Amino acid sequence: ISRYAVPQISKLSNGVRVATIPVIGEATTLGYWIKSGSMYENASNSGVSHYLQHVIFRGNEKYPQRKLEQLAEYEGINLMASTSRVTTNFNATISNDKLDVATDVLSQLVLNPRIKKSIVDNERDTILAEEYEVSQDINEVIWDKLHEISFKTSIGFPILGSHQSIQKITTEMVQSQHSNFFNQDNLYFVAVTSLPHDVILKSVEKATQFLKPLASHPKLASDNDLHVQKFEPNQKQYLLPQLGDNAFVAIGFEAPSLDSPLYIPSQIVKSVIGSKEKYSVSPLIENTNIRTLNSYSFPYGNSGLTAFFGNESINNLNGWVNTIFQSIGTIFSNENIEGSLNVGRLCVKSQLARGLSSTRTIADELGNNLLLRNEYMSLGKWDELLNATNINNIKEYFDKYILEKNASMVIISGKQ
Amino acid sequence: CVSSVLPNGIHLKLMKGPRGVCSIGAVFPIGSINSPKTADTQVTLSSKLVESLISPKHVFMHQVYPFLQVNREYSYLTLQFLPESTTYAIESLKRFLDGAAPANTTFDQQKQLNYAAEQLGEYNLLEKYKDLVCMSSFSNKSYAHGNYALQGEKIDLNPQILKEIPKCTTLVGSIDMYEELVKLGGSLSPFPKVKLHITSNFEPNHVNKNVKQSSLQGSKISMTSSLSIMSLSWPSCGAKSVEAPAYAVLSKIFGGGSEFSSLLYTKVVGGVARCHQAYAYNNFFTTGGRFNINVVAEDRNLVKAAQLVRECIHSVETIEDKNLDAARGLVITAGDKRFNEFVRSSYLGCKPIYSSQYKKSIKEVTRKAVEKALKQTFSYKPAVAVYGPAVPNEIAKVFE
Ligand SMILES: [Zn+2]
């Protein structure tokens, strides 16, 4: 756990900003958070950010693949990476006696890669298989289809790239993404730790001794205003008869930007609908027998997407759609809005409480917060903002985002 | 762990650590073997749980996270929540322990969910290995009772176990729930039942669960619904044995992995075309253990996989020091899931997987201890269980 804290941030003379937040315990999560992701791509390089992420982790001169494998096996340096639409990270969760090796590996891999045609060409099959695998989880497929028909802009791209895009990715494209997106001024080193701030700082200093300062600062290729998103509600239906007597469906609305005063209202409304679990279903849902329900709301630059999705038997599909639309409408009723606000606020608080017990979760929020917000948002200010959120804020959110708005919708049917 | 005994005899075990999420629950020695068939226990306890929580809406509105684990010989219920939901959570645990049968309508709803388990993502590869092991490696045939009914078979409420639960319950909780659990425990009848339950002896049976799999499982079009599963079991040791950490190390030496680096991975996953995955587990029961190696592959290829598993066994005897240390390293995984492990380890009477004491145990396992474990386990003929049509005796021949 973590004690309503605040990060401490120092900048090395080479430009690398080191952000730490104090945590009790013996686990440390640390690594690099970079504003690199599919939002910053176009049609010509779709999939490159994720493709780079893999190449990075295929090792460099100092730490080739065999040396990496050896470090996980014998030395307990278990490296993790992921790429989203908006950010990328390379991290390790470690015992504290492993600090210098971990800061050294991560710095070398992220900031000193050696990107070769052979490693790039050799990686292609791994990414093709990953794309195949994700394509067999219909929650992932319908999530991507919903993004695709809602955004003609780059948010509509799958993170991995289409099959065709994965095949066309060149070494030059991978090197270009690293050269334009992985500089000191587009990233933070993050550590969630008991170790003092200065210990992390010196260790990163030592790990990044090869790194020369930037001569200049061209406008970051990751700036949101270079990738203005346009949400346009559309409907598309697909077949997948391998599903049998089953269909997937997803409903989408535009959501507020992260810095919108209406962001927290959208999170509360999304949460009060929430997900269906084995024992748990929103009081807004009338037919509690619906097979399943998942709700998400993400910000994407000037835009964002609120999504509701599930699967049902063919005969229950249309009823699922009505239940969800009815539940969303029910929040706006003056008899229900107060209670919806209260329950939704509690949902957001419970989600927060659950995040505070893991150094991995804390690291990811801190890294994302630093990259994506104008100014750092503490859990402190966040809770006050949640507590000060009122019925008029919810109404204004409904007025701007929900009421009288066309929704996107995708259906993938076993029969249709 | 802070361990107490209430004035009425009820045991109370508390997990130390920082505040944030409150945890409560109950663990008791009633499992799928205490009903006359597969799923009877599971659906009885599930029916009871949903009634105890009043409605799914109450659960959501209080943001309570319930979790029910039914095993062959024992089960537990945990509830996680923020401090403002304490009253509802405790009152729900109290109702669960009140002995009353659920309504037939609740039971009917729960039965339908149970039949749908595989389609719903609730009957995954892990649960299949457990059923295959339990239906094949015990002399007592009651261990064949799992949690997930076959499509053509009946499921019946077992009201007697609901009466039995409060008579053999241990209460569990995070340390901040001490006062509320003392009080809840106090409300239960003195004094607990004491039953000698003993894990059934090993027997190397050869069985099939030749049953079709649904194409959609959860949200995935399963990459395994057309493949067979081979589970090979040998007896090992109780969770309390001095030998258990050697067994954990022995399971990492075999290890495994998916097509989507250790003996099972390199030799079995690498050696059979279209072998989706292979893994070794060491699974614990009240007084014993089953060391099990599970292979997912096409039906025609299982015999070959078994030959490659035999090779893995032979290979362990000459394992290098590098690898014996790496195996020791792999067991050390520190990382909600913490409380569930606390409860599990409290029943087994072993040190939790996250504890430093456990980590120290693992650091202290020798080559001798691993060799001893290997010798006594692989001296038995394996139990053999196939999810699919493959003839288990043909697989069994590979080891005789
Ligand atoms: Zn990937």
User: Does A13 share its domain with A141?
Assistant: yes
Closest CA to A266 of A311, A320, A308, A323: A308
CB contact under 8 A, A1 and B261: no
Rounded (5°) CA angle A73-A76-A80: 95
A16 and A139 co-located in one domain:
yes
Q: With an 8 Å Cβ cutoff, is A354 touching chain B?
A: yes
A1, A24, A73, A145: best to mutate for the B interface, most B CBs within 10 A: A73
CB < 8 Å to A78, chain B: none
**A337-355 and A391-401 helices, crossing angle to 10°:** 90
Q: Is residue A3 part of a domain?
A: no
DSSP helix/strand/coil, A306: strand
3-state helix, strand, coil split of chain B in percent (to 5) is 40, 20, 40
- The whole-angstrom separation of Cα A349 and Cα A268 is 10
Distance CA A372, CA A301 (A): 9
Q: Is the peptide bond before A309 cis (omega within 30 degrees of 0)?
A: no
**In chain B, where are the structural domains located?**
2-186, 206-397
Question: Cα separation of A301 and A374, whole Å?
Answer: 12
3-state secondary structure at position A35: coil
β-pairing, A17-22 vs A8-11, is: antiparallel
Q: Hey, are the CB atoms on A354 and B221 less than 8 Å from each other?
A: no
- Residue A180: its H or E element: helix A171-181
* B19: amino acid identity, one letter: R
Who's near A150: CB < 8 A, 6+ residues apart? A156, A231, A232, A233, A234, A252, A254, A305, A408
- Cα end-to-end span (Å), chain B: 46
Instruction: Say which residues have a Cβ less than 8 Å from residue B97's Cβ, sequence separation at least 6.
Output: B26, B165, B166, B169, B184, B188
**DSSP state, residue B391:** -
Looking at the fold, whether A172 and A272 belong to one and the same domain comes out as no
Q: Are residues A119 and A268 in the same domain?
A: no
CA distance B23 to A243: 39
Residue A45 and residue A151 in one domain:
yes
**Nearest CA-CA distance, residue A37 and chain B, Å:** 23
Query: What CATH number should be reported for the domain holding residue A48?
Result: 3.30.830.10
Distance from CA of B113 to the nearest CA of A (A): 10
Indicate the SS3 state at residue B72. Answer: coil
Q: Which residue of A has its CA nearest to B335?
A: A358
Residue A223 domain flag: no
Q: Is A91 left (phi over 0), alpha (psi -120 to 50) or beta?
A: beta
Chain A residues in contact with B59 (beta carbon < 8 A): 279-281
Alpha helices, DSSP H only, in A208-311?
Answer: 263-273
Q: Does A235 touch chain B (CB under 8 A)?
A: no
Going by the DSSP 8-state scheme, the letter that residue B21 receives in this structure is S
Report the run of H or E that residue A27 belongs to, with start and end: strand A27-34
Q: Are B188 and B8 in contact (CB under 8 A)?
A: yes
Other C-beta atoms closer than 10 Å to the C-beta of A361 total 15
Examine the domain organization and report whether A20 and A79 are in the same domain.
yes
If you ran DSSP here, which 8-state letter would residue A59 be given? B
Instruction: Kindly write down the DSSP assignment for every residue of B260-323, as one continuous string.
Output: ---HIIIIIITTSTT--EEEEEEEE-SS-EEEEEEEEE-GGGHHHHHHHHHHHHHHHTT--HHH
Distance CA B242, CA B240 (A): 7
DSSP state of B63: T
Q: What letter represents residue B93's amino acid? A: L
Domain range for residue A239? 235-413
Ion ligand 1, residues whose Cβ is below 5 A away: A 130
Q: A47: which DSSP letter?
A: T
CA-nearest residue to A358 within chain B is: B335
Question: Rounded to a whole number, what is the distance in Å from the CA of A72 to chain B's nearest CA?
Answer: 9
Distance separating alpha carbons of residues A285 and A210, to the nearest angstrom:
58
H or E stretch at A142: helix A138-150
What does R_g of chain A's alpha carbons equal in angstroms?
22
Token code pair at residue A378: 């503490």
Alpha carbon of B149 to those of A400, B201, B211: distances in Å? 49, 25, 11
Separation CA A53–CA A65 (nearest Å)? 14
Q: Taking CB atoms and an 8 Å cutoff, what residues of chain B touch A344?
A: none
Domain boundary pick from A187, A217, A247: A217
Same domain for A156 and A245, yes or no, is: no
Q: Which residues contact B90 (CB under 8 A, 6 or more apart)?
A: B24, B180, B184
Under 8 Å between Cβ of B27 and B78: no
Residue A183 corresponds to which amino acid?
A: N
User: Is the CB of B335 less than 8 angstroms away from the CB of A279?
Assistant: no
Indicate the DSSP class of residue A39.
G
Measured N-to-C along each axis, helices A391-401 and A314-332 cross at an angle, to the nearest 10 degrees, of 130
Residue type at B157?
Answer: L
* Total residue count of chain A as it appears in this document: 416
> Does domain B2-186 bear CATH number 3.30.830.10?
yes
Tell me: do A42 and A188 sit in the same domain.
yes
Handedness of CA A83, A84, A90, A95 (dihedral sign): negative
SS3 of residue B172 by DSSP: strand
Q: Cα separation of B336 and A379, whole Å? A: 21
The domain boundary residue, chosen from A184, A217, A250: A217
Whether A91 and A211 map to the same domain: the answer is yes
Joined together, the tokens standing for residue B336 give: 């909600």
Tokens 């045609």 appear where? A117
| Chain A neighbors of B220, CB-CB under 8 A | 136-138
Tokens of B161: 């176990």
Helices (DSSP H) in A230-378: which residue ranges? 263-273, 314-332, 337-355, 359-372
* Paired residues of A82 in beta bridges: A89
Q: Which H or E run includes A386?
A: helix A379-388
DSSP state of A279: S
Other C-beta atoms closer than 10 Å to the C-beta of A225 total 8
Residue of A nearest to B216 (CA): A243
Task: Say how many domains are in chain A.
Answer: 2
Exposed, middle or buried, A199 (CB in 10 Å: 0-12/13-18/19+)?
A: middle
Half-sphere exposure of B356 (CA within 13 A, CB side): 4
Minimum-distance CB partner of B60 among A282, A349, A353: A282
CA distance from start to end of chain A: 49
**B221 interaction partners in chain A (CB closer than 8 Å):** 136, 138, 240, 242-243
C-alpha A260/C-alpha A252 separation (Å) is: 19
User: Is residue B81 left, alpha or beta, with left meaning phi > 0 and alpha meaning psi from -120 to 50?
Assistant: beta
Distance between CA A108 and CA A90 in Å, rounded?
11
The residues, ordered by sequence, that sit 6+ positions from A220 with a Cβ below 8 Å of its Cβ are: A35, A185, A186
Gap between the Cα atoms of A211 and B359, Å rounded: 38
Hunting for tokens 């176990």 — which residue is that?
B161
Task: Identify the DSSP state of B336.
Answer: -
Tell me if chain A has a CB within 8 Å of the CB of B64. Answer: yes
Q: How far is residue B109's CA from residue B119's CA, in Å, rounded to a whole number?
A: 16
CB A203 within 8 A of CB A22: no
**What are the CA-CA distances from residue A254 to residues A265, A305, A392, A398 (Å)?**
13, 5, 20, 11
Compute the distance between CA of residue A162 and CA of residue A160 in angstroms, rounded to an integer: 7
DSSP string, A114-131: ---HHHHHHHHHHHHHHH
Token pair for residue B341? 């492990």
Boundary of a domain, candidates A161, A189, A217: A217
Judged by a CB distance cut-off of 8 A, whether residue A340 touches chain B is: no
Residue A229 lies in a domain: no
The Cα A263–Cα A92 span in angstroms is: 31
Q: How many angstroms separate the CA atoms of A373 and A371, rounded? A: 6
**Nearest CA among B70, B228, B76 for reference residue B145:** B70
DSSP, res A157:
S
Q: Note whether residue A230 is domain-resident.
A: no
Question: Which residues, 6 or more positions from A55, have their beta carbon under 8 angstroms from its beta carbon?
Answer: A113, A115, A119, A120, A123, A174
Contacts of B73 (CB under 8 A, 6+ apart): B29, B31, B33, B197, B199, B285, B286
Dihedral of CA atoms B169, B175, B176, B180 in degrees, nearest 10, equals: 20
CB B65 within 8 A of CB B80: yes
A151 and A188 assigned to the same domain: yes
In angstroms, rounded to a whole number, what is the distance separating the alpha carbons of residues B109 and A160?
A: 40
In this structure, are strands A408-413 and A235-239 parallel, antiparallel, or unpaired?
Answer: parallel
Place of tokens 């390199």: B266
Q: Is residue A16 part of a domain?
A: yes
Which tokens belong to A380?
């402190």
C-alpha–C-alpha distance, residues A64 and A60, integer Å: 5
What gap in Å lies between CA B345 and CA B362, rounded to an integer? Answer: 16
The architecture (CATH level 2) of B206-397 comes to 2-Layer Sandwich (3.30)
Residue B363: phi and psi, rounded to 5, are -65, -30
Alpha-carbon distance values, B237 to A130, A191, B33, B201, B246 (Å): 39, 41, 20, 12, 10
Task: Report the alpha-carbon angle A298-A302-A303, nearest 5.
Answer: 40
Q: Is B317 exposed, middle or buried (0-12, 13-18, 19+ CB in 10 A)?
A: exposed
B279 to A109, A131, B19, B257, B308: CA distances (angstroms): 31, 24, 36, 6, 13
CA A103/CA B265 separation, integer angstroms: 30
Domains B2-186 and B206-397 share a fold: yes
Report CA torsion sign: B184, B188, B194, B200. Answer: negative
**DSSP secondary structure letter of residue A293:** -
Is residue A133 located within the same domain as residue A211? yes
**Optimal mutation site among A279, A314, A415, interface B, most CBs of chain B within 10 A:** A279
- β-bridge mates for residue A18, sequence order: A10, A189
- Specify the amino acid at residue A335: E
**Structural domain includes residue A244:** yes
Q: Distance (Å, rounded) from C-alpha A139 to C-alpha A319?
A: 19
Phi-psi region of A59 (alpha: psi -120 to 50; beta: other; left: phi over 0): left
Q: Determine, yes or no, domain membership for A271.
A: yes
Cα-atom radius of gyration of chain B, to the nearest Å? 22
Whether residues A195 and A272 share a domain: the answer is no
Domain-located, residue A139: yes
Q: What is the C-alpha separation between B383 and B399, in angstroms, rounded? A: 10
